[PDB]
Ligand binder design. Structure first.
Ligand SMILES: CCCCCCCCCCCCCCCCCC(=O)OC[C@H](COP(=O)(O)OCCN)OC(=O)CCCCCCCCCCCCCCCCC
Ligand SMILES: CCCCCCCCCCCCCCCCCC(=O)OC[C@H](COP(=O)(O)OCCN)OC(=O)CCCCCCCCCCCCCCCCC
Ligand SMILES: CCCCCCCCCCCCCCCCCC(=O)OC[C@H](COP(=O)(O)OCCN)OC(=O)CCCCCCCCCCCCCCCCC
Ligand SMILES: CCCCCCCCCCC1=C(C)C(=O)C(OC)=C(OC)C1=O
Ligand SMILES: CCCCCCCCCCCCCCCCCCCC
Ligand SMILES: CCCCCCCCCCCCCCCCCCCC
Ligand SMILES: CCCCCCCCCCCCCCCCCCCC
Ligand SMILES: CCCCCCCCCCCCCCCCCCCC
Lengths: 478, 129, 100, 300, 322, 162
């Protein structure tokens, strides 16, 4: 099978993102202009987002031995492109706080966006590997973008060493899986077995090593300890991108890998994934109890929400409802993290020196900056799965999927973790309103983005039918 | 076949006699000729006068960025090594893809040249004035 | 006449050796050699896996693996440069400011 | 108010001041040179560069500077010159040029030798100058005595000075070309130096240290046939010079190694006492052969 | 041991040993020939007194180098110090071990070929690096750093300069390369590849003008100044077999190797290799040494894009005529 | 060829073990080059000639710049060696040694349970790898070039002096 102009049309966001990455690189080489480079990044990402329409008009196609494009890939492409656009929008005033060069940030942002597209359209072990590292490497760049800062350099070193080790683990597991199977496509990972002989120690150990690597990428326990350190160390737009786009992209490729492979029917993988989900939910919700820092609290929040997502993913083989639940909760998670980390980005922007403290001091935010406090408190209302918000719709979908396949331990863990999350989220929300002891249109653009996220959360919590409809329209190959 | 085994044996004997000749040459150099007994024999040569410190100090270098770019460009080079041996069977589609590859390489190199990378010369001379 | 199991065992041995050299060494450089050892062991396992089935896919995965190894070595070397310039010491146990 | 008042000719372990009248001049008056282990160690430690005495600031908070002794005995060091140079990587931070490894005490010899016997010592002051080194000494002595030399003496001394100037400039060009990296034209340049040496052997009787100029004239008269050798040299030179130019001095590699390297303006050439080629290259047209013409240089 | 297969294996082994002895003896004879040819280029004779024409000067130099005191410094790492001449002597010899000198006269008919040459160059850099670091000298340290920078400069584009010839032959085998030039020699279609490979191959052996590590004028002989005895002679012989290897490699990938119209094939190979050896002596004598920062700038900004453009043009020409 | 594979595996194991437990960085790099040459011998034994060729071509370039950083940073005489010696203590390495041992035991047990037919040692030329690399695996090449571009940009940004 070769490449056709129809396949060229179906690859439009990847082509647009790569071409505009080359464009912004050549613009950096031509002249160090910040506004023009960030602007070209914005039209590049928006051009990919509107070429999604032409991809949808094209149709689902198996474009490569590697790539398969359908509604699943289109939806996750749209989510990661929205996250990249928001990351640029919040990164702009923080970069006018930056004394050093500010142009490589957006270049790394759309290279990581290209990696997200590659993971979204991934239907191959090679493409999955390349997407993981094409997401990871610009995050190594962006976490240590402010290398003069202590915490940014420390988090960059930690994330680089840990993600290279996890890439080594995932590569070795992929090599063992390929040694057993002899083909690297997702659909052929366990096709030679039959009559109940789907379990074999080499394939199981290979998939366990990929489970280790991917659970590092989704902060699953016990590969979760990097998350608060990296989230606090990295800049606030970098924290936004790592919380949104990376988590959506690797969880989408994990959903793809566990749906199109025949290894999902194996009970041992399901049991160990249930154990990982239980541990992730309980540990992530418990560790954010006495946290006085917003970034580490949101890191443990990311751990707990990826545990909920894994709980939804476990019941994929029995029920035909788990995939749309995963999509709905991923959309709600994207909007929630975008709003929350956007408030962190606006209250962190501009970059007021590396040696000066970057403490948040969220207490009493309403009395001087009321709109950002309103967005932050509705964001914590959304993160706890409280009604009139999209997080409740995601939690309801996860609970219904768990009830459908009779996974009661996960349901109890969800309830307990939701109670602890209620405690610390609403403690933050009330502390927003207590008694504590700009002037540019890009800061206004970031305020518009967080206000749009808050209004979307409220509207889709009150009326969740359009989101469910557009998620069910993303109907991939059964 | 017979010729493959003959060439493998010839290559093995080539390596064996090469290392044997080198080791015998070193042994003959080491064992023939008298030694020396001098006060300042075991001093590193710094043009007749003693050193200020040692030769094992922390030497700076300006070649770090060029070293990393060398490794990256050698990996792109190995990709082109894989391409070049099968150009005829790849067809024109492979030519277009390798043209995109080399265009990304050229854009990266122009980016390196223009931003001040690959330019580590001291600001005093720089072959100016 | 070479079993695949012996090659996979060899790759696993070098993999755990690189992991041990990563964990027991607090020098950032020796961690970078450790990482290169694990990456090359995984690539070696891919090469044996491709050689067993007579496919070029293992060698393609090897090429991707060494591309990742080179890029990660360059980035880790730059981070090591920054750490040694801004702290004058290459101990990774001193990188512990963020906790709790 | 002087910043670093330290010895520059004599070593730091030296007692007495050599140019004072009570200090003896000859080494046979003093004890002979016995090199023992203790004296060798003391003089080797005295010659050791101590960076705190010049305020060198050895090392930095991040990475250490490394000190290099280029001379003495370096292929690029043209003589007994030692420079102590501080490097960060390849870049030079500061330089401490140490001289005194070539001191002969020629002024004390001027207080030791007679007027006539001091001419070989003046000749060896610059060993590529010869008669050019002889000329100011004998002219100053003729000023002291009240001697006006005839025209033929002036022409002979001008001719010998220009011959040795061509020899010195040939050696300088060959050493510059070799120091850039081209090792070929130095052999041909020394062949033209051999032609000049044949002419100078014919006239003065010696190759490189002629010791030929005298008070009020020269030692001998010109031998029968010097014009033939001068004609041969004047035919031999310009084609060889054009060959050297087209082979090395128009090379773009030599231009890259040479143009823009160690450039200074007229204020640096004036405040530092720079004369000769550097002063004329800075636009200051102060030549002694034109501004204050000596030895009948107005006739050329 | 009476079998046609075993006598064929023995004949191949004998041919490989003969090739090795001849190239080592030719490297030493061409050290002597460098002395004589530098004399010829610089309007003199050089050593012409030890025997007829100075032919026994090499034997006298060998006697002196064997009976010179082989000195290992106390401040040096002894194993690395002894190991560096071994690498310098052997890496370029194994690089030569793939060069086909005649039809039916080759040591190893590898399927990699010029890949093996790139491997041996990448292994040959460690001889200079280990000689610079091990000897524990500041001049040797600066020479090793300069050698590393020069190696960056040339090895960024050496293989890409060879990829034009690789693409034209369509294979990595040496005999396929020398058989693809049966009509036209590869210097005419690959000319930019030819000049870039000339620059990179002079930089392989660190010969002039790329003698940044062992610069006589700049660092006072550079990295091997603590090196003495037969180890320094091993450095010399290793660089001279390096020159022979690069010359024979240009003969094979740009001048048809052994292919010639009238003379026997080994005679044509010998004449072209000797012409390139003469060109090495001429390139030492003729033009001066540039600054290594400008050397690396020239190797990065000029040579590498030129090799990439030449590879693209060669691929387009090859696919046009298919 | 079987003996070559086994002896290269043994040399790689011993050299890696000497790498991970050495105090001299340059000696550790030398043992690393020995280990990578042994890995290349393993690659050349199995018929993957291109894999061993690139293992010696571009990894020797990679260990080269590691050597440049080692001489630029670490070498201070014995001061690096004693500082590394005080760091390594018996309990410190017997901590994770049992973890690596049990991990190796589990992985080996999982490996031994697979069906095998023996690697026939059929050589794979670089032409087939070129066909597959620029055929079915095109976007792997293109987005890997983008990956190398990203790594180059990050190396520029973080590695700068000022
Ligand atoms: C000690 C070493 C003794 C000799 C070892 C064997 C040498 C021959 C050999 O390895 O041959 C295998 C391969 C060539 O095989 P080939 O002829 O291409 O395949 C059959 C054709 N259908 O050739 C190769 O694999 C050669 C490539 C690797 C050579 C490494 C040489 C040493 C490098 C480190 C030096 C220190
Ligand atoms: C078997 C293998 C060997 C076979 C023997 C025959 C071939 C021998 C090949 C020898 C190659 C030598 C290459 C030397 C390259 C030197 C490059 C260099 O450093 O150039 C720098 C120099 C100054 O650069 P600049 O821009 O002024 O400085 C920037 C500072 N701000 O830049 C300049 O001065 C500008 C001019 C640069 C010229 C670069 C080299 C041109 C090509 C090589 C020379 C010709 C060789 C023979 C060609 C065929 C002749 C028939
Ligand atoms: C201790 C000294 C070094 C020991 C390791 C290297 C030599 C090992 C012994 C090799 C002896 C020759 C041999 O067994 O060759 C067989 C084979 C030939 O190649 P192939 O074409 O695959 O075989 C089918 C033949 N028709 O050969 C092969 O397939 C590969 C042969 C080995 C790989 C090439 C050489 C690698 C050298 C690594 C050196 C590491 C540092 C020491
Ligand atoms: C290369 C063989 C000799 C060629 C002819 C002489 C080359 C120029 C030598 C210049 C020089 C002089 C005069 C010189 O006096 C000197 O100091 C002792 C040097 O350093 C060793 C020199 O290099
Ligand atoms: C003691 C007085 C407290 C006054 C609190 C006022 C809070 C105003 C909130 C306005 C709406 C914000 C968004 C809610 C969702
Ligand atoms: C702290 C978390 C507590 C979770 C309790 C979950 C209880 C699940 C009970 C399942 C029973 C299944 C019987 C068949
Ligand atoms: C100056 C020539 C340098 C050559 C270096 C390589 C020589 C290797 C040894 C070759 C020996 C065999 C020569 C060919 C024999 C068969 C043909 C004979 C008639 C010409
Ligand atoms: C100052 C900080 C130092 C941190 C050193 C960390 C060393 C960790 C060593 C872990 C060893 C584990 C051995 C196996 C334990 C049992 C199996 C896992 C738990 C069930």
């Amino acid at each position: 099978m070769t490449i056709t102009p129809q396949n060229l049309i179906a690859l439009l966001p990847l082509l647009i993102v790569g071409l505009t990455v080359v464009v912004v690189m050549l613009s950096i080489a031509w002249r160090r202009n910040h506004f023009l480079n960030a602007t070209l990044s914005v039209i590049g990402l928006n051009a990919a987002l509107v070429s999604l329409w032409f991809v949808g008009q094209a149709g689902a196609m198996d474009v490569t031995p590697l790539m398969r494009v359908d509604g699943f890939a289109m939806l996750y492409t749209g989510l990661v492109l929205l996250a990249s656009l928001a990351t640029c929008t919040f990164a702009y005033p923080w970069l006018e706080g930056y004394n050093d060069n500010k142009d490589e940030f957006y270049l790394l942002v759309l290279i990581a966006a290209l990696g997200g597209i590659l993971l979204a359209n991934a239907n191959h072990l090679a493409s999955l590997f390349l997407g993981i590292e094409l997401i990871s490497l610009p995050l190594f760049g962006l976490v240590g973008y402010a290398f003069r800062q202590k915490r940014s350099l420390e988090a960059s070193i930690k994330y680089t060493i840990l993600s290279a080790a996890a890439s080594s683990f995932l590569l070795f597991g992929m090599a063992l899986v390929y040694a057993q199977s002899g083909d690297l496509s997702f659909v052929a990972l366990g096709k030679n077995l039959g009559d109940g002989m789907l379990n074999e120690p080499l394939l199981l150990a290979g998939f366990g090593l990929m489970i280790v690597g991917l659970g590092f990428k989704l902060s699953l326990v016990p590969f979760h300890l990097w998350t608060p350190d990296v989230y606090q160390g990295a800049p606030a737009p970098v924290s936004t991108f790592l919380a949104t786009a990376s988590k959506i992209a690797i969880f989408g490729v994990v959903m793809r890998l566990f749906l199109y492979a025949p290894v999902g029917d194996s009970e041992a993988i399901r049991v160990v994934l249930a154990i990982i989900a239980f541990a992730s939910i309980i540990f992530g919700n418990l560790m954010a109890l006495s946290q006085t820092n917003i970034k580490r609290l949101l890191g443990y929040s990311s751990i707990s929400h990826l545990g909920y997502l894994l709980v939804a993913l476990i019941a994929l083989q029995t029920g035909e409802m788990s995939m749309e639940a995963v999509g709905v909760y991923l959309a709600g998670y994207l909007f929630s993290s975008l709003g929350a980390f956007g408030v962190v980005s606006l209250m962190s922007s501009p970059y007021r020196g590396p040696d000066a403290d970057s403490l948040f001091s969220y207490r009493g935010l309403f009395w001087h900056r009321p709109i950002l406090a309103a967005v932050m408190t509705v964001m914590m209302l959304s993160l706890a799965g409280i009604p009139m918000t999209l997080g409740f719709i995601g939690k309801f979908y996860v609970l219904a999927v768990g009830v459908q396949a009779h996974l009661w331990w996960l349901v109890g863990a969800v309830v307990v973790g939701s109670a602890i999350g209620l405690y610390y989220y609403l403690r933050v929300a009330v502390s927003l309103y207590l008694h504590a002891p700009p002037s540019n249109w890009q800061y206004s653009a970031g305020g518009i983005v967080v206000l749009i996220s808050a209004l979307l959360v409220l509207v889709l919590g009150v009326w969740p039918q359009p989101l469910i409809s557009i998620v069910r329209l993303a109907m991939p190959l059964m | 076949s017979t010729e493959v085994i003959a060439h493998h044996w010839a290559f093995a004997i080539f390596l064996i006699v090469a290392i044997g000749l080198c080791c015998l040459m070193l042994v003959g150099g080491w064992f023939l000729g008298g030694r020396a007994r001098a006060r300042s024999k075991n001093v590193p040569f710094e043009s007749g006068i003693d050193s200020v410190g040692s030769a094992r100090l922390r030497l700076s270098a300006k070649f770090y960025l060029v070293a990393m770019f060398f490794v990256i460009f050698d990996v792109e080079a190995l990709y082109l090594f894989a391409w070049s041996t099968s150009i005829r069977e790849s067809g024109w589609v492979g030519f277009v893809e390798a043209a995109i590859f080399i265009f990304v390489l050229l854009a990266g190199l122009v980016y390196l040249v223009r931003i001040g990378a690959l330019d580590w010369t001291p600001a005093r001379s720089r072959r100016e004035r | 006449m070479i079993p695949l199991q012996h090659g996979l065992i060899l790759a696993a041995i070098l993999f755990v050796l690189g992991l041990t050299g990563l964990v027991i060494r607090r020098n950032l450089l020796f961690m970078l050699i450790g990482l290169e050892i694990m990456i090359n062991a995984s690539a070696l396992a891919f090469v044996v896996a491709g050689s067993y089935w007579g496919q070029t896919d293992g060698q393609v995965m090897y090429i991707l693996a060494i591309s990742l190894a080179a890029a990660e070595a360059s980035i880790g070397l730059a981070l090591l440069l920054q750490l040694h310039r801004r702290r004058q010491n290459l101990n990774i146990d001193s990188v512990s400011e963020m906790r709790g | 108010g002087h910043p670093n008042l330290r010895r520059i000719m004599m070593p730091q372990t030296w007692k007495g001041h050599p140019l004072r009248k009570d200090y003896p001049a000859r080494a046979t008056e003093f004890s002979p040179f016995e090199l023992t282990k203790a004296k060798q160690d003391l003089e080797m430690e005295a010659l050791t560069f101590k960076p705190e005495e010049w305020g060198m600031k050895r090392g930095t908070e991040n990475e250490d500077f490394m000190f290099l002794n280029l001379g003495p005995n370096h292929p690029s060091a043209h003589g007994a010159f030692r420079i102590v140079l501080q490097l960060d990587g390849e870049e030079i931070v500061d330089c401490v040029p140490d001289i005194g490894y070539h001191h002969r005490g020629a002024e004390k010899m001027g207080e030791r030798q007679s007027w006539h016997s001091y001419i070989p010592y003046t000749d060896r002051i610059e060993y590529l100058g010869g008669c050019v080194n002889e000329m100011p000494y004998v002219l100053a002595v003729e000023k002291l005595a009240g001697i006006t030399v005839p025209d033929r003496v002036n022409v002979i001394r001008v001719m010998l000075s220009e011959l040795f100037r061509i020899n010195s400039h040939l050696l300088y060009i060959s050493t510059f070309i070799q120091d850039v990296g081209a090792m070929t034209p130095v052999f041909f340049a020394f062949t033209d130096r051999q032609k000049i040496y044949d002419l100078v052997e014919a006239i003065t009787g010696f190759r490189m240290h002629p010791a030929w100029f005298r008070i009020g004239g020269v030692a001998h008269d010109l031998p029968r046939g010097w014009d033939r050798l001068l004609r041969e040299f004047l035919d031999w030179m310009p084609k060889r010079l054009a060959s050297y130019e087209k082979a090395a001095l128009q090379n773009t590699i030599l231009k890259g190694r040479s143009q823009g390297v160690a450039a200074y303006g007229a204020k640096e050439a004036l405040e530092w006492g720079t004369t000769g080629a550097g002063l004329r290259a800075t636009g200051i047209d102060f030549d002694v052969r034109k501004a204050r013409p000596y030895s009948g240089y107005e006739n050329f | 041991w009476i079998s046609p297969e075993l006598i064929e294996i023995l004949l191949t082994i004998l041919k490989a040993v003969v090739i090795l002895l001849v190239v080592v003896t030719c490297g030493a004879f061409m050290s002597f020939g460098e002395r004589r040819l530098l004399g010829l280029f610089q309007n003199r004779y050089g050593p012409n007194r030890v025997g007829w024409g100075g032919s026994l000067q090499l034997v006298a130099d060998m006697i002196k180098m064997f009976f010179k005191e082989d000195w290992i410094p106390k401040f040096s790492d002894r194993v690395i110090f002894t190991l560096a001449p071994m690498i310098a002597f052997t890496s370029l010899l194994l690089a030569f071990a793939i060069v086909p000198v005649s039809p039916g006269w080759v040591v190893a008919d590898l399927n990699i070929g010029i890949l093996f040459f790139l491997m041996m160059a990448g292994l040959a850099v460690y001889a200079v690096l280990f000689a610079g670091w091990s000897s524990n000298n500041k001049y040797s340290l600066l020479g090793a750093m300069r050698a590393s920078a020069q190696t960056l400069s040339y090895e960024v584009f050496l293989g890409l300069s060879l990829m034009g010839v690789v693409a034209q032959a369509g294979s990595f085998n040496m005999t396929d390369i020398v058989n693809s030039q049966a009509h036209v020699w590869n210097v005419i279609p690959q000319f930019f590849g030819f000049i870039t490979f000339a620059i990179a191959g002079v930089a392989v052996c660190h010969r002039h003008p790329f003698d940044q590590p062992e610069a006589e004028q700049e660092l006072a002989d550079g990295y091997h100044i603590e090196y003495s005895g037969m180890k320094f002679g091993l450095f010399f012989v290793g660089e001279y077999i390096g020159i022979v290897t690069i010359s024979a490699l240009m003969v094979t990938l740009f001048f048809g190797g052994w292919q010639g119209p009238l003379l026997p094939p080994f005679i044509w190979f010998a004449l072209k290799t000797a012409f390139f050896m003469m060109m090495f002596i001429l390139i030492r004598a003729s033009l001066p040494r540039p600054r290594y920062d400008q050397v690396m700038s020239f190797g990065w900004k000029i040579c590498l894009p030129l090799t990439l453009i030449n590879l693209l043009v060669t691929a387009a020409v090859i696919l046009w005529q298919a | 060829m079987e003996f070559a594979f086994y002896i290269c595996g043994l040399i790689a194991i011993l050299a890696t073990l000497r790498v991970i437990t050495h105090t001299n960085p340059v000696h550790a790099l030398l043992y690393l080059i020995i280990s990578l040459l042994a890995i290349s011998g393993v690659f050349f034994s199995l018929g993957a000639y291109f894999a061993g060729a690139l293992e010696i071509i571009v990894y020797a370039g990679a260990i080269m710049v590691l050597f440049v950083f080692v001489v630029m940073m670490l070498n201070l005489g014995g001061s690096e060696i004693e500082q590394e010696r005080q760091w390594l203590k018996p309990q410190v390495w017997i901590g994770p040694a049992i973890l690596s041992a049990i991990m190796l035991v589990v992985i080996v047990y999982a490996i031994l349970g697979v069906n095998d037919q023996g690697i026939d040692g059929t050589p794979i030329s670089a032409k087939a790898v070129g066909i597959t690399l620029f055929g079915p695996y095109v976007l792997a090449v293109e987005l890997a070039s983008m990956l190398l571009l990203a790594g180059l940009v990050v190396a520029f940004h973080v590695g700068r002096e000022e």
